Design an enzyme around this catalytic site. Sequence first.
Site, PDB file in Angstrom:
ATOM      1  CB  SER A  18     -21.697  17.818  -6.035  1.00  0.00           C
ATOM      2  OG  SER A  18     -21.673  19.154  -5.534  1.00  0.00           O
ATOM      3  CG  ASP A  75     -18.913  15.364  -0.519  1.00  0.00           C
ATOM      4  OD1 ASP A  75     -19.318  15.178   0.657  1.00  0.00           O
ATOM      5  OD2 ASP A  75     -17.806  15.820  -0.820  1.00  0.00           O
ATOM      6  CG  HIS A 133     -17.087  18.491  -3.571  1.00  0.00           C
ATOM      7  ND1 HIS A 133     -18.130  17.773  -2.977  1.00  0.00           N
ATOM      8  CD2 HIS A 133     -17.631  19.185  -4.598  1.00  0.00           C
ATOM      9  CE1 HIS A 133     -19.249  18.041  -3.623  1.00  0.00           C
ATOM     10  NE2 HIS A 133     -18.970  18.887  -4.629  1.00  0.00           N
TER      11      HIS A 133
END
Length: 370
Positions: free
Chosen positions: A220, A243, A298
């Site tokens: 992330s 991600d 996620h």
Amino acid sequence: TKIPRGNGPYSVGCTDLMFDHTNKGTFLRLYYPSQDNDRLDTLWIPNKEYFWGLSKFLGTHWLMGNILRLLFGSMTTPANWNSPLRPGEKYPLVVFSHGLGAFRTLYSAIGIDLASHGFIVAAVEHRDRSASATYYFKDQSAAEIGDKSWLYLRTLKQEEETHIRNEQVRQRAKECSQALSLILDIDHGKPVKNALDLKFDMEQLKDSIDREKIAVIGHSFGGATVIQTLSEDQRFRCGIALDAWMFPLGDEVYSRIPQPLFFINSEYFQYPANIIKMKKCYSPDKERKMITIRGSVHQNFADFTFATGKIIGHMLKLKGDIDSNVAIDLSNKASLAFLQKHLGLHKDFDQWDCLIEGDDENLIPGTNIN
């Protein structure tokens, strides 16, 4: 614990390294091939202030901190705490960068799997105020007493999101680079007093690193950190962005990454404004691969996907339609093949070369956004 054991042939140990003791020093959790497999006793979330930090991140109050601590305060992760380093070989090294509201201990499923395949992994704790919490020591005496100074996530106003996220990703890249410099210096005999008093003798890390085989991995905010770090620091020979959240990056970054870069995306997180930035990394003179895990959200990349049961998992968005164990296997195996390709490892990870191309019932080649 339901955090999966490593699938690789090596037993896995875990310890913590802080050096120097200050807010500008390096803090990381180390996952490494163990000599002995005596007991899987590493505490997952080892301090109460991280539950308070998590609570503030999720936007809840004082009470939810104590509930999470009641639920998870004693939960272990499957690694031998302070187990001796397995001697007589040089291991490739991964520096791992956590996302927004996380901290060094929340990607143990990823770190324990890489270690069980013969990697040392340094999971960095960021001091950019992106961690839900972190600590440091105001002086050597405070580090000797264990008298911790705590630092909690900074809540941002929309007006400053562009400026501060970019300042944070730059600091994060500096932290990945500093952590690499710490480990390489220990590898070549720098004497270090760990600011934490743990039974693991950091001397063991002397001449334990294969210095040409260094990768940076992150989730992330951490995926953005991968790209920043690669751009600044050619000691990192490849990058794996799990991600990637691309918003923090400056446009100057996209032209400056010669290293191979792998994007492993969740089906259910990605959006066109994010994907376009990923595609600005592509260039016929560069190796860029992208896969998507089918039925993944996620959180499938982080340890909270293993913390609850199937139904509460889905309710809370910690799990997707895919099994959490099946998602992380695809991520870890794809990662291993990629690290074998671009670090020149002499292992059997090329068996999963097909997962890099998205050739599985549970992978999409590239992105659904295409």
